[PDB]
């Protein structure tokens, strides 16, 4: 097995053993993690199933990250749930710790979006101009799509 | 009243020496901003985007550098100025001309010790001031001259 493949297995097992709750799909290159909205943000209270796919060229190429249940955020395509790959790539390196996607990358993205060049223009505009509507829109999406109730 | 303040604060900024481009409306615009004399930013040129929230001026503007800048309280990738740092200076009677005449030059002269948005910039500022200045100089030449802005 390649250095890249050895890293995939080691990385994913490391992630499985972490505090993060992992469900494996087709194999170790596709898993889903239960992710909780960060405290002190409009996402607080939300629960999401975040799917991660690892490319064959991992870890040189970054994982792709998608929210399987709906989220409203300037840098996440609403209809697909896909996190902006340019944003992931600003953080990702060949030695970046996969567990930090959940501990560090995603909490910080949700807390502090980049509303310039957004994947969700609606969310970006509200973020910048109507922060109270932005927060309320997120709270409504949480109640409709991102509670334990909604997920079952 | 707040909206009356938005319209007149923006029109005053338009009337001032500061060069303003309006984007979607009076609540979003870009101002051409020159690095303050006697700081490591001296000589740099930036396009600074300001967005005004509906409850302005009770709520502060958000402020982003549209071409790259290296500073502890500014997120390098997005150009976003730390909103907590903005809020420490913002009041309901603060206006827009002072964002450019007072707030931003004082911030570029004196980074704020609030948890940094640029950790690399904070570490250099604090422990390697000479490398901090050199890196800013390099970023200015690369991202923040009139020529770099044309491109
Ligand atoms: Na003007």
UniProtKB/Swiss-Prot annotation, chain B:
Keywords: Acetylation, ATP-binding, Nucleotide-binding, Transferase, Ubl conjugation, Ubl conjugation pathway. Its EC number is 2.3.2.23, 2.3.2.24. Residues 1-145 form the UBC core domain. GO terms for molecular function: ATP binding; ubiquitin conjugating enzyme activity; ubiquitin-protein transferase activity. Autoubiquitinated in vitro in the presence of NEDD4L. The active site is at residue 82. The modification N6-acetyllysine is found at residue 55. Belongs to the ubiquitin-conjugating enzyme family. Accepts ubiquitin from the E1 complex and catalyzes its covalent attachment to other proteins. E2 ubiquitin conjugating enzyme that transfers ubiquitin to MAEA, a core component of the CTLH E3 ubiquitin-protein ligase complex. In vitro catalyzes 'Lys-11'- and 'Lys-48'-linked polyubiquitination. Capable, in vitro, to ubiquitinate histone H2A. This is Ubiquitin-conjugating enzyme E2 H. The lineage of its organism: Eukaryota, Metazoa, Chordata, Craniata, Vertebrata.
């Amino acid at each position: 097995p390649s250095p890249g493949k050895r890293r995939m297995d080691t990385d994913v097992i490391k992630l499985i053993e972490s505090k993060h709750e992992v469900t494996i799909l087709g194999g170790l290159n596709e898993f889903v993690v239960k992710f909780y909205g960060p405290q002190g943000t409009p996402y607080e209270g939300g629960v999401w199933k975040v799917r991660v796919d690892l490319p064959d060229k991992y870890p040189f190429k970054s994982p792709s990250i998608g929210f399987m249940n709906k989220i409203f955020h300037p840098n996440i395509d609403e209809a697909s749930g896909t996190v902006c790959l340019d944003v992931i790539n600003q953080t990702w390196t060949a030695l970046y710790d996969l567990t930090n996607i959940f501990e560090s990358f995603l909490p910080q993205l949700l807390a502090y979006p980049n509303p310039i060049d957004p994947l969700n223009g609606d969310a970006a505009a509200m973020y910048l101009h109507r922060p109270e509507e932005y927060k309320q829109k997120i709270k409504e999406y949480i109640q409709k799509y991102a509670t334990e109730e909604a997920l079952k």
